[PDB]
Amino acid sequence: SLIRKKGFYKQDVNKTAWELPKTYVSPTHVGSGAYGSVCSAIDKRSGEKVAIKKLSRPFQSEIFAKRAYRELLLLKHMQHENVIGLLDVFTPASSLRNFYDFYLVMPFMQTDLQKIMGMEFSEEKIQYLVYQMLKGLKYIHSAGVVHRDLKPGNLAVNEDCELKILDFGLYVVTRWYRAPEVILSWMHYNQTVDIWSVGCIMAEMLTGKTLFKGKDYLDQLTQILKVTGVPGTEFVQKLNDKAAKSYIQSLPQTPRKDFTQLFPRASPQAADLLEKMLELDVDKRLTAAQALTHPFFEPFRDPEEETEAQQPFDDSLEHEKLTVDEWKQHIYKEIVNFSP
Numbered sequence: 273s274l275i276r277k278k279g280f281y282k283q284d285v286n287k288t289a290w291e292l293p294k295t296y297v298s299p300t301h302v303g304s305g306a307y308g309s310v311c312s313a314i315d316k317r318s319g320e321k322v323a324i325k326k327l328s329r330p331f332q333s334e335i336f337a338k339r340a341y342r343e344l345l346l347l348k349h350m351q352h353e354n355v356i357g358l359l360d361v362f363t364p365a366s367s368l369r370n371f372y373d374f375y376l377v378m379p380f381m382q383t384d385l386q387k388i389m390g391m392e393f394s395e396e397k398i399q400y401l402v403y404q405m406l407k408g409l410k411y412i413h414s415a416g417v418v419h420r421d422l423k424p425g426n427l428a429v430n431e432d433c434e435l436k437i438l439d440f441g442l443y444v445v446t447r448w449y450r451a452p453e454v455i456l457s458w459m460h461y462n463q464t465v466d467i468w469s470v471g472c473i474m475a476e477m478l479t480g481k482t483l484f485k486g487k488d489y490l491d492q493l494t495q496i497l498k499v500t501g502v503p504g505t506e507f508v509q510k511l512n513d514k515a516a517k518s519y520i521q522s523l524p525q526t527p528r529k530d531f532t533q534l535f536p537r538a539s540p541q542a543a544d545l546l547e548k549m550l551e552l553d554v555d556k557r558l559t560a561a562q563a564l565t566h567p568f569f570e571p572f573r574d575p576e577e578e579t580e581a582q583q584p585f586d587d588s589l590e591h592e593k594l595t596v597d598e599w600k601q602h603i604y605k606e607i608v609n610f611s612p
């Protein structure tokens with residue numbers, strides 16, 4: 273019987289107590305979040321900088337335990353350059369009675385797109401970043417996983433502009449990057465909801481300004497339609513929301529675009545790619561794989577880097593309804609069963 277496993281040491285980080293293995297040193301506060309907090313550290317074994325996430329009271333309710341479990345499984349399942357992944361998982365606990373929390377170890381990312389946004393952006397930089405986005409999206413999609421909430425705050429970068437996607441498999445919150453069909457639920461969505469997000473993010477890189485805002489979903493829609501133009505009969509028919517369909521048929525039918533005019537500084541190839549991602553029709557909107565073939569990425573394209581998951585993300589317990597204690601049992605085993 274022990275207080276914590278050997279080789280662990282107690283240290284305060286950002287005025288909270290952290291219990292870390294010896295191999296991780298010089299922990300340094302990074303951020304405090306909704307369900308945990310993060311620090312950086314040096315893996316003295318390799319001297320490389322990692323990020324360590326302390327889960328906060330993951331076992332306080334079935335909802336917290338599932339979520340914490342889900343994050344672990346997803347990070348573990350994805351193996352891709354542009355998708356955040358797992359280097360290590362640990363807990364100071366020595367038994368189930370001990371089991372209060374666990375730590376996720378991941379590669380350290382200096383910053384994110386939300387924090388370096390606004391600064392003009394050359395098209396070459398845009399080509400490079402967006403190309404990495406699409407590759408990561410192609411990978412998670414191929415595993416049957418959609419992000420649903422892609423945003424600059426979710427795209428981590430280092431100083432070399434290497435990119436990894438975060439937080440995949442997640443009144444009036446801001447929904448600037450969200451797909452119309454999700455905000456209005458006016459037809460069923462596919463994996464190309466994330467592509468809409470990429471379009472909004474790319475557009476913002478080009479101009480320095482958020483593409484779509486609005487106090488409420490209707491004003492956002494009005495801003496979206498200024499750009500996409502009012503959709504034609506082919507699209508209108510696919511709508512499963514008759515009230516929305518009515519509303520759309522009753523609008524001043526303002527024709528689409530000329531994205532060359534909406535983005536008067538964009539290259540033809542960039543405007544063309546934008547046109548195909550900012551597409552209302554979820555059946556015509558580009559997939560990640562298809563957008564990767566676009567000429568806008570010619571200088572960076574390497575088909576070999578455009579991998580797919582070999583296996584679909586398969587959580588048999590995704591639907592299950594279990595007791596917090598049972599959840600801890602599974603999370604506990606996964607941690608034991610893990611290997612770096």
Ligand SMILES: O=C(Nc1ccc(Oc2ccncc2)cc1)c1ccnc(N2CCOCC2)c1
Binds near residue numbers: 310340379
């Ligand atoms: O990226 C993730 N986690 C994560 C991202 C960044 C992070 O902090 C870092 C990482 C690297 N460098 C700096 C900070 C810590 C955890 C992540 C992936 C997939 N699913 C996630 N969840 C879905 C279920 O509930 C919410 C959690 C989280």
